[PDB]
Amino acid sequence: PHKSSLPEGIRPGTVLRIRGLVPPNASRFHVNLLCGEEQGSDAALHFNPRLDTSEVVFNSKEQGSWGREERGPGVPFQRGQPFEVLIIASDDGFKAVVGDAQYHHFRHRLPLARVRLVEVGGDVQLDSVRIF
């Protein structure tokens, strides 16, 4: 479970870059942008590649409740293989890039200014997590 606190929050122009490996027997992993360090904190972005159901879901969470799910085209991950993801913050929302192409655009639901933490967890082998 990787954690990067963002005490001063994030602005348009923030780039989260994640490099890692999906274990041979992965079912799913996630990348969350949370609004606090405490369990149950709202999620501005929840990014959830699911190898077991061959999807990638996007969602937010407010007052403990999940919002409407968005999904991207199939699943640009595959068990046993390295990956690289960028999550890019803009004024409009977050851009998710996998490999060499933008994968999904997730329009802001919560104010970007609320974001205070990055969590990466689940069946993922993490090589590096860098915030630029």
Declared resolution, Å: 2.0
* Counted domains in the chain: 1
62 among annotated binding-site residues: no
Question: How far apart (Å, rounded) are the C-alpha atoms in residues 28 and 6?
Answer: 25
Q: Residue 70 annotated as binding?
A: yes
- Match 């996007």 to its residue by tokens: 58
* Cα(57)–Cα(66) distance, integer angstroms: 12
Query: What is the residue range of 6's domain?
Result: 1-132
From the number of C-beta atoms within 10 Å of its C-beta (0-12, 13-18, 19+), residue 118 rates as buried
Question: Can you give the CATH number for the domain in which 69 is found?
Answer: 2.60.120.200
Beta-carbon count within 10 A of 40 CB? 10
State yes or no: 40 annotated in a binding site. Answer: no
Distance CA(51)–CA(55), nearest Å, equals 7
Query: Is 67 flagged in the annotation as binding?
Result: yes
Find out whether 71 is annotated in a ligand binding site: yes
Going 2 to 67 to 56 to 11, the CA torsion angle's sign is negative
